[PDB]
Scaffold this motif. Structure first.
Motif, mmCIF file in Angstrom:
data_model
loop_
_atom_site.group_PDB
_atom_site.id
_atom_site.type_symbol
_atom_site.label_atom_id
_atom_site.label_comp_id
_atom_site.label_asym_id
_atom_site.label_seq_id
_atom_site.Cartn_x
_atom_site.Cartn_y
_atom_site.Cartn_z
ATOM 1 N N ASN A 2 -5.302 2.295 6.086
ATOM 2 C CA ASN A 2 -5.502 2.187 4.651
ATOM 3 C C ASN A 2 -4.149 2.097 3.963
ATOM 4 O OD1 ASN A 2 -6.130 2.622 1.861
ATOM 5 N ND2 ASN A 2 -8.055 3.590 2.483
ATOM 6 N N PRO A 3 -3.776 0.946 3.394
ATOM 7 C CA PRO A 3 -2.450 0.822 2.773
ATOM 8 C C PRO A 3 -2.325 1.530 1.437
ATOM 9 C CG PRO A 3 -3.615 -1.327 2.991
ATOM 10 C CD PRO A 3 -4.618 -0.231 3.138
ATOM 11 N N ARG A 4 -3.438 1.939 0.822
ATOM 12 C CA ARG A 4 -3.373 2.621 -0.464
ATOM 13 C C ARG A 4 -2.916 4.068 -0.334
ATOM 14 N NH1 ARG A 4 -8.727 1.029 -3.170
ATOM 15 N NH2 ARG A 4 -8.004 -1.134 -3.404
ATOM 16 N N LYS A 5 -2.973 4.636 0.868
ATOM 17 C CA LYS A 5 -2.560 6.017 1.068
ATOM 18 C C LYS A 5 -1.065 6.161 0.822
ATOM 19 C CE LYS A 5 -6.640 7.316 2.929
ATOM 20 N NZ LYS A 5 -7.392 8.585 2.720
ATOM 21 N N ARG A 6 -0.682 7.290 0.237
ATOM 22 C CA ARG A 6 0.708 7.590 -0.071
ATOM 23 C C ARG A 6 1.129 8.827 0.701
ATOM 24 N NH1 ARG A 6 0.430 9.627 -4.604
ATOM 25 N NH2 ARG A 6 2.641 9.794 -5.194
ATOM 26 N N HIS A 7 2.309 8.769 1.309
ATOM 27 C CA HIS A 7 2.886 9.968 1.883
ATOM 28 C C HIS A 7 3.495 10.830 0.778
ATOM 29 C CE1 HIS A 7 1.996 8.771 5.907
ATOM 30 N NE2 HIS A 7 2.768 7.699 5.867
ATOM 31 N N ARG A 8 3.966 12.010 1.168
ATOM 32 C CA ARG A 8 4.443 12.991 0.201
ATOM 33 C C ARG A 8 5.709 12.506 -0.495
ATOM 34 N NH1 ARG A 8 3.367 16.813 3.552
ATOM 35 N NH2 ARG A 8 1.290 17.512 2.863
ATOM 36 N N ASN B 248 -2.274 16.172 4.720
ATOM 37 C CA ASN B 248 -1.740 15.284 5.749
ATOM 38 C C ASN B 248 -2.853 14.474 6.399
ATOM 39 O OD1 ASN B 248 0.877 16.103 5.299
ATOM 40 N ND2 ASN B 248 0.944 17.543 7.020
ATOM 41 N N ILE B 249 -3.972 15.130 6.713
ATOM 42 C CA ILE B 249 -5.058 14.466 7.428
ATOM 43 C C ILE B 249 -5.653 13.347 6.584
ATOM 44 C CG2 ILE B 249 -7.382 14.798 8.348
ATOM 45 C CD1 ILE B 249 -6.438 17.607 9.260
ATOM 46 N N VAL B 250 -5.734 13.545 5.263
ATOM 47 C CA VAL B 250 -6.284 12.500 4.399
ATOM 48 C C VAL B 250 -5.289 11.390 4.105
ATOM 49 C CG1 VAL B 250 -7.811 14.182 3.306
ATOM 50 C CG2 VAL B 250 -5.688 13.513 2.161
ATOM 51 N N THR B 251 -4.068 11.459 4.642
ATOM 52 C CA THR B 251 -3.206 10.283 4.644
ATOM 53 C C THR B 251 -3.571 9.307 5.756
ATOM 54 O OG1 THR B 251 -1.481 11.180 6.100
ATOM 55 C CG2 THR B 251 -1.349 11.734 3.756
ATOM 56 N N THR B 257 -10.233 10.937 6.977
ATOM 57 C CA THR B 257 -10.472 11.512 5.656
ATOM 58 C C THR B 257 -11.918 11.976 5.508
ATOM 59 O OG1 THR B 257 -8.742 10.130 4.673
ATOM 60 C CG2 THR B 257 -10.404 11.038 3.184
ATOM 61 N N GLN B 258 -12.865 11.203 6.050
ATOM 62 C CA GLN B 258 -14.276 11.547 5.922
ATOM 63 C C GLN B 258 -14.594 12.885 6.574
ATOM 64 O OE1 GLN B 258 -16.444 9.997 3.961
ATOM 65 N NE2 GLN B 258 -17.794 11.724 4.455
ATOM 66 N N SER B 289 -5.437 12.234 -4.795
ATOM 67 C CA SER B 289 -5.042 10.841 -4.977
ATOM 68 C C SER B 289 -5.240 10.032 -3.704
ATOM 69 C CB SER B 289 -3.586 10.760 -5.439
ATOM 70 O OG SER B 289 -2.689 11.072 -4.387
ATOM 71 N N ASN B 290 -5.073 10.660 -2.543
ATOM 72 C CA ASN B 290 -5.313 9.961 -1.291
ATOM 73 C C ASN B 290 -6.794 9.882 -0.948
ATOM 74 O OD1 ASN B 290 -2.762 9.050 -0.513
ATOM 75 N ND2 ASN B 290 -2.218 11.002 0.453
ATOM 76 N N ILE B 291 -7.620 10.763 -1.516
ATOM 77 C CA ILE B 291 -9.062 10.625 -1.349
ATOM 78 C C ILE B 291 -9.606 9.528 -2.259
ATOM 79 C CG2 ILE B 291 -11.270 11.773 -1.601
ATOM 80 C CD1 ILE B 291 -9.839 14.393 -0.780
#
Lengths: 9, 426, 10
Positions: A2-8, B248-251, B257-258, B289-291
């Motif tokens: 998923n490219p929309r995910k952002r790291h910290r 971290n897991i939902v990245t 994520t599910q 935001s990652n969800i």
């Protein structure tokens, strides 16, 4: 996978 | 007795050929190194005492001097990188690993502590400790039917040292070392001691801070529900690493994520997104935001759990870095959401706190917000409701902000501002 | 909270 995910910032 | 020795006296005693003289001098060195204010670590290193301490680690027939030098080397190793390196340079790693099998619990515990300090310096020393074979003796110390029969302080030191073997990222720990450690980590994650639990979650948070393959090794051990349970702990030293692990897991993938959603994590987020510690709120909003960057059915679960009003909340009032994560949460939501989901955002009051944040000097958060507004207008076009939204943005002073932003030093703040005006504010 | 290294005062 998923490219929309952002790291910290 | 052995209190307040000069370094010169310590050297004199260690350099005698009298084991008992060396024991007393070594203990005196341990006491010097144990004080809180400015222990003379460099003075001890400079006197050439590390080779002697390491040599004392091997004196099986005098276990007190094994303990005192182990404690002394532990505290040298607890300093700067150069100070830890001096301990490593003296051959301490294999000598400490040999002490893990000591019949004296306090000596093996000290060796556990020392290896934790050495591994804690960074990935190179961490991988060197692994190469010397530390993991098997460490895990053997936890190979018991019930962890509760081990001494509390002993168990906490093992957990903490194991967490350092999982820490640091360039490179990440060797894949086979992580696989070897994980089943013990999973067992520690179910222990009842708050400190074991905190450090266990810290270890999991390190392991999930990487590519999706690293996340998957952890996720498929089934720890996600237990992580969610710990997410609701009353002890903040447990919640913080648990939340870092969950975020971290939902990245990872939508599938990984599910599993966080399936485990019931979203029900905790009303508390997390209002949590009084600012860093919890930041982490929880970043997680959100990652969800909202996921699938539409995952956005729907955010809606179902009543979390959009909480995002409106932190957008309206929070520390700025949390507010920017909330902006990201909205923009991600508007990128993947359905028309109905995006319309619901407006009904919950997202527009005005969104507009107020265009006051910020952070250029990237302005880009984020303008992308959200454009996406919301796109949802409005498919309904013939673009103007009802334009008046809404105008009535709360948002139009004055978008119009002012055409004179911004960044060249896509303006180029999105003027396009918004050109298309919707004619 | 999660220090890389730990000193032993005891």
């Amino acid at each position: 996978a998923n490219p929309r995910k952002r790291h910290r910032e | 007795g052995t209190v307040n020795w000069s370094v010169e006296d310590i050297v004199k005693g260690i350099n005698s050929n009298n084991l008992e003289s060396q024991l007393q001098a070594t203990q005196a060195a341990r006491k010097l190194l144990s004080r809180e204010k400015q222990p003379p670590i460099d003075n001890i290193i400079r006197a050439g005492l590390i080779p002697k301490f390491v040599s004392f680690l091997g004196k099986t027939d005098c276990s007190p001097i094994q303990f005192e030098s182990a404690w002394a080397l532990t505290n040298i190793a607890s300093g700067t990188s150069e100070q830890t390196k001096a301990v490593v340079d003296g051959g301490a790693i294999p000598a400490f690993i040999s002490l893990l099998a000591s019949p004296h619990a306090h000596i093996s515990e000290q060796a556990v502590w020392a290896l934790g300090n050495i591994a804690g310096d960074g990935s190179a020393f961490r991988d060197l400790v692994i190469k010397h074979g530390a993991i098997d003796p460490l895990l053997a110390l936890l190979a018991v039917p019930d962890l509760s029969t081990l001494a509390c302080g002993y168990l906490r030191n093992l957990t903490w040292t194991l967490s350092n073997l999982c820490r640091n990222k360039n490179p990440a720990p060797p894949l086979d070392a992580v696989e070897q450690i994980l089943p013990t980590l999973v067992r520690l994650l179910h222990h009842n001691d708050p400190e074991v639990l905190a450090d266990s979650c810290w270890a999991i948070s390190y392991l999930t801070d990487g590519p999706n393959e690293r996340i998957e090794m952890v996720v498929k051990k089934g720890v996600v529900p237990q992580l969610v349970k710990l997410l609701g702990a009353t002890e903040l030293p447990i919640v913080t690493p648990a939340l870092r692990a969950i975020g971290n897991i939902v990245t990872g993938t939508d599938e990984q994520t599910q599993k966080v959603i399936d485990a019931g994590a979203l029900a905790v987020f009303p508390s997390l997104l209002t949590n009084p510690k600012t860093n919890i709120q930041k982490e929880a909003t970043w997680t959100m935001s990652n969800i909202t960057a996921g699938r539409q059915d995952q956005i729907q679960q955010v809606v179902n759990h009543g979390l959009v009003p909480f995002l409106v909340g932190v957008l309206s009032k929070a520390d700025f870095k949390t507010q920017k994560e909330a902006a990201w949460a909205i923009t991600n939501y508007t990128s993947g959401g359905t028309v109905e989901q995006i319309v619901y955002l407006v009904h919950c009051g997202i527009i005005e706190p969104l507009m107020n944040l265009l006051s910020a000097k952070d250029t990237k958060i302005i880009q984020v917000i303008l992308d959200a507004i454009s996406n919301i207008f796109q949802a409005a076009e498919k309904l013939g409701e673009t103007e009802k939204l334009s008046i809404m943005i105008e009535e709360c002073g948002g139009l004055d902000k978008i119009e002012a932003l055409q004179r911004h030093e960044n060249e896509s703040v303006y180029k999105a501002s003027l396009n918004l005006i050109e298309k919707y504010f004619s």
